[PDB]
Write a protein that binds this ligand. Structure first.
Ligand code: ZN
Ligand code: ZN
Ligand code: ZN
Ligand code: ZN
Ligand code: ZN
Ligand code: ZN
Ligand code: ZN
Ligand code: ZN
Ligand code: ZN
Lengths: 326, 326, 326
């Protein structure tokens, strides 16, 4: 029985980080306790001041990544302060029954509720508010013994990074400029019309064109293995590490399945999270992007990863530098 | 030789049902005989009276699902009554040679023809009229010994359901309202222009926004295993069972391949059929949908499954009901 | 060490052909030397004279396919004559570090450079100019022992064919006709606006609506096994052999992974190359196409394969020819 089990309380962190956690664990089924605070707000989403009338779990797009193990129970306290304007809920793709929890978690402003479900299937899993993919994140459910390659050999990551990718549908006034709305409710009707064209005005990693560039680049060092968790609650995307690979990729994001190796580009189905391991072998700046290069370069779906360490001439070498043609 | 074999005659049924059939079978290679009647007609496809100038196999979108076993031969009598206006044919993705049969089956109004081909590859397979994905269905070819999991362990379904998903491209007049055409031939030119924008006006399960909702919901009981066969002859879709999973999914729909487990969302390539098993564990209403939530909610790609049985507190429990914040 | 190894010089050929090469090889790690000449030019891309302001490796879309083995080193001399107008580079998805080589290969008109990298991961891999998917091709890296099926059984192809698929975004003037630009630089601004709609004006195999039809059809004979290499540096496509199958398909295009069998339609992620084997069993004309039939028929993503040999009545037979209804 679940009630008769130990309870742990987890402190969540902002994306792109994932809270500290154990991979392989001698430990036993726990009930893991999480709390999240829904937050409506306006956000600047590009370099030119365009705003989005947003809804978030915990203030961030994406919401934070919750981590448990196969067999653990997730118990989430979902809070929706009075400072907000709408009901909300949460649908956990990792959970079974009641529209993934959506039905047991409808909370008006100033309300709260608490859900428990068995996390009995390993993998990365999207949770989102039932009709809003803008409010989403990843539930990572690790197998009790850690990640395994197709032959059962152990696998691991030294650091985890979390990337939620968002297709945005921002309306334009008669002048051709993006509309700014005073409330969430007023954005609604125009946004739907733009959504019906199926053409995003913007596709952003982590809230904003550039969220994962400049001072905000991800980081690693040569010899380090990194887990890239990629979620997209609404639209297909195709992650690619420029100059890298996915050493082992669960593109459908479910750990009881063997991963694929050596991927150049993988595929995240809209309504899901997937996961890729890469061990760095060269230093420098990498681009992690959506390999529709229009969606990446023109619309916003690209980030960087600054990698420290020693250059390897065996893997790659500049034989003749750029020079005039003989 | 095929001629020297026993012949069976199968009675087809309307979607979402699949005609009664054997899974694992001690039986031997049969020649299975099917007949289909092509039918052009106008259809109401949404809640507001929008019509589509349609073509169907057997009166329904999708056409009925034909079921055989690996090694069986499909022999189809394709009929096109005089009451119709165009030639038609059938391309079976399950068949080898002659454009999947398209070349041996061109039938003008008042004509008919009969095709046989070896069904020598297991899987769910799309058949459609050569230039019209609107006229399509699934050929399920079962392995002679039934469905197998990745380790060879036997698998099964207690009931099969069939979902054909259709991207529709309905033209608008200068006033902004959907055009109504008196014939199939007059819809053609405007529809092509809208098709060239690659933006469906509608994406429907089984003919109509709502075909699989209300009184028409699919049905199951807790402890039952259901096969969800999903076909899309023209455009990519991404099925998801809200509150459920795909326990075992052949997303490319070919049974000699190991299935994947625990999928939250799977992917059907345009021009194919895939297949998912789910064993229910909770009662209530589920939504089976295209997890581009614009395509589902705004455009029409969503259905329901009403599930009877006993609630399970272990899997999911409401710990604190929605209540004011302390 | 790489410098201490034998060097081979390979002569490249125009698509759809792939230069002669060994599959399984008793031979040892070589350093393979390739040279490519970048070429800007205007091209006619459809039947009605529409032009594209193009950039190519070696004069062709796609660029030629480079073939090596796992363990070999690729050393490419990249040349950009003075007759051109822009810098260019190359990003090899098969390579590790320095943005796949892009950083070590920026070459202005009249410059050249030479890159070496270890090809240490088997598979088909896209190489392209960093911001232009129009300039792309495939690096096929074969496993040293040849293609293997999921059980380790040997596989082979008798001939290889190469298909690069290109989504084109051609601007229209106020009259509704495609714009013709005098330089590459003048096409830029209008093209970007059209790209931002994410709606190709054209999707072409190998440079041109029809490049792989009529006298230019691919060819085979019954009993022959063919490798279809399919690359798409920018957008998702879904190859399908009408009347055929993918006997063994590495849709993510990476050979250390087991292939899937019996596929009706496969999926190439934008930013990747995949690969399918088919052994012909029937003669006639086949269509190899993108199974979004709008993208194929209306936009240009379809080709033919003329197959010689003996008709097989076991696989497929016309039982009753088209005839009046009794
Ligand atoms: Zn909400
Ligand atoms: Zn490590
Ligand atoms: Zn969902
Ligand atoms: Zn037809
Ligand atoms: Zn059962
Ligand atoms: Zn087809
Ligand atoms: Zn370039
Ligand atoms: Zn051969
Ligand atoms: Zn690339």
């Amino acid at each position: 029985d679940a009630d008769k089990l130990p309870h742990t309380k987890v402190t969540l962190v902002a994306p792109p980080q994932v809270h500290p956690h154990e991979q392989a664990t001698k430990s036993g089924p726990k009930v893991v306790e999480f709390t999240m605070t829904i937050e409506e707000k306006k956000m600047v989403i590009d370099d030119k001041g365009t705003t989005l009338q947003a809804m978030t779990f915990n203030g961030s797009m994406p919401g934070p990544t919750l981590v448990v193990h196969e067999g653990d129970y997730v118990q989430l306290t979902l809070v929706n302060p009075a400072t907000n304007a709408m009901p909300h809920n949460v649908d956990f793709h990792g959970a079974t029954g009641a529209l993934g929890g959506a039905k047991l978690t409808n909370v008006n402003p100033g309300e709260q509720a608490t859900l428990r479900f068995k996390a009995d299937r390993s993998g990365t899993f999207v949770y989102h508010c039932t009709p809003h993919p803008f409010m989403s994140g990843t539930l990572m459910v690790l197998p009790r013994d850690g990640l395994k390659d197709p032959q059962g050999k152990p696998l691991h990551y030294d650091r985890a990074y979390t990337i939620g990718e968002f297709d945005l549908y921002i309306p334009k006034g008669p002048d051709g400029k993006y509309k700014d709305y005073a409330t969430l409710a007023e954005s609604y009707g125009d946004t739907v019309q733009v959504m019906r064209t199926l053409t995003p005005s913007h596709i952003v990693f982590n809230g904003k064109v550039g969220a994962l560039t400049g001072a905000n680049a991800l980081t690693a060092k040569v010899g380090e293995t990194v887990l890239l968790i990629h979620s997209q609650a609404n639209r297909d995307t195709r992650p690619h590490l420029i100059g890298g690979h996915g050493d082992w990729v669960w593109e459908t994001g479910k750990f009881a399945n063997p991963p694929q190796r050596d991927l150049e580009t993988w595929f995240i189905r809209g309504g899901s999270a997937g996961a890729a391991l890469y061990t760095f072998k060269q230093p420098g700046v990498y681009a992690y992007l959506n390999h529709n290069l229009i969606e990446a370069f023109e619309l916003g779906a690209a980030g960087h990863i600054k990698v420290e360490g020693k250059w390897n001439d065996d893997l790659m070498k500049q034989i003749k530098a750029p020079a005039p043609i003989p």
